[model samples]
Target chain A: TPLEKALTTMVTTFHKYSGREGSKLTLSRKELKELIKKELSIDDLMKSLDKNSDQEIDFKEYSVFLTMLCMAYNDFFL
Target chain B: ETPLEKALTTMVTTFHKYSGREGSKLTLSRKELKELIKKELCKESSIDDLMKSLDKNSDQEIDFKEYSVFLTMLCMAYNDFFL
Candidate 1:
């Protein structure tokens, strides 16, 4: 679930800290998932991250995914 | 290009190699995968890499969506060699 963790962590961070120092007041889980879905497409997200279509991810996969996500959206952070 | 397609393809292939990839008939055991990864890819790659890097189970050797991400990575890593 490396990709999931990385994505969830990053998305949570974004949604959690919107305008505050470590807090985002206007974001929601659905919204974040939607954003991810939009950027990478949920199908792609599931394929890369889910091995069994089990809807769950392992740590390493999550980590590599985190790396990929960051690469994919580096501009957003900047 | 598509994340799901890329991820699924990578997962399927890698899961089957005698290295990290398993075959549909027989998923390669961890030990075998480790040897293969070390021989080719990085040793530090977790079992996940082993399970997600080969095409033994591909049913098809390698179609784009299945191996696209890996191919990109491989190309990037070996561009100089190939070029």
Candidate 2:
């Protein structure tokens, strides 16, 4: 199903970028920039997503980050 | 764009496709919820008690946040079922 595939994409996409650096489950600076550059790419996106200011994005932070992005796109969609 | 970004975009648009049809356009009413399920979700089935399940604030409507949470809520199921 499309919805199910979307969900999987979310997790897999995070892992794809996250695995390219320090933590196999988190995204570091270069990994994050590369992922976004080659992907959707958000600046404030990288800035705020790093809630811990550790310059890394964990799965949890990533999830919340996407949630925020959803709304950002939400305005555009509406 | 990445698969993940596309996924996120679909979720927002698909959600709006139905949610924006009526009401606040920022929330999903019960009817809209059901419609989205049967339509965008490719329902493959029926939905019962879902309106209330997603209506976290008990407003009889599923707000954007609630809807997002619902998708997040489905993450595990999608993973397990994907197997």
Candidate 3:
């Protein structure tokens, strides 16, 4: 069930930060900043993601970014 | 690394292990996914249908974003399991 938990942790992180985003259907700029600036340490990531006009992001956009980080780590670390 | 980070790497590593073997380096075709489900995931059901569900572009191939789309369904699929 590791795979399932991986997806579980997927949403857990989303909820933890998404709650920070204040119950919007998606995480917003506020929570986005909190996550990357402190935990992820990436400043420019926000500007590039989920920029679909109104500046809010649903879970899909956020989750897609998370997977991308894994790809980057794989390439960068090894 | 945190459990979350560990999970992330595991997810990506598994994808590349199969996706890179044949089609594109980081992409999956129908045949690749059938193998991925049987091997890496060890989870299968309506796999062709599942592949159809994953293919947002209707291209019969999957990219990282398309793969992550499954997580969208993951929430719905797993919601009842917990509660």
Candidate 4:
């Protein structure tokens, strides 16, 4: 439903945000958890995104990042 | 990092509905919209203000665009209040 928003958010989250200018370009599990929490207060967002459960999220976990990001974006339609 | 902030920002950025939305995807019934407001609005909230802001159709139901704006505003409000 919100295709533009989905793509924009994906690019923004993974790119050099003005908020994280000095930090590393890559996103850590904690960072992703924060992103997911913004929309999901259920706490499951943390668990689901923490695919490896090694206290972090690696590139492997982003396999469906774009799709899930879109799904969550569409969820606002609710 | 503040996970909460990230989640809220992501949700807003990913679902920005804009101020001009319509059709089946954007069209929302009054009842459905009321439920959404209740879910998103902070506790002890004033429905009057929310309704007034979202009453775009004049019939009372808020379209996706209105709700999208609401979420964005609420997100900013949350940041101001919490962060």
Q: Give the best candidate by DockQ.
A: 2
lDDT of 4: 0.46
Per-residue alpha-carbon lDDT of model 4 for A1-78, expressed as tens digits? 233333233445444221342334334545664555553432465477556675444333442454454345566544
- Residue A52 local lDDT, model 1: 52
> Interface RMSD in Å per candidate, to 1 decimal?
13.3, 2.3, 3.2, 11.7
* Per-residue accuracy of model 2 over A6-57 as CA lDDT, tens digit each: 8878777777777786878788878877776677745577787888888788
lDDT comparing candidate 3 with the true structure: 0.68
The residue ranges of model 2 lying beyond 4 angstroms of the native Cα positions read: A41-47, B20-22, B42-53, B76-83
Could you tell me every candidate's TM-score relative to the true structure?
A: 0.29, 0.75, 0.64, 0.36
Docking class for model 3 is: acceptable
Candidate 3 Cα errors over 4 Å, as ranges? A41-43, B17-32, B38-45, B55-83
Rank the candidate models, highest DockQ first.
Answer: 2, 3, 4, 1
Q: Deviation in angstroms for A32 in model 4?
A: 15
Higher-lDDT candidate of 1 and 3: 3
Pairs clashing within candidate 4: A34-B3, A34-B7, A35-B6, A35-B7, A37-B7, A38-B7, A38-B8, A39-B7
> What overall lDDT, based on C-alpha atoms, would model 2 receive against the true structure?
0.75
Best-to-worst TM-score order = 2, 3, 4, 1
In the range B1-83, model 2's lDDT, one tens digit per residue, is 66767888888877777888888988888788888776655542244467767777888888888999888767645534543
I-RMSD for candidate 4: 11.7
Q: What share of the true interface contacts does each candidate keep?
A: 0.02, 0.65, 0.35, 0.02
Lowest summed lDDT across 10 adjacent residues in model 3 chain B is found at B74-83
Give the Å shift of residue B14 in candidate 1.
Answer: 1.0
CAPRI-style class, candidate 2? acceptable
Task: Give the DockQ-based CAPRI class for model 1.
Answer: incorrect
lDDT of 3 at B59: 85
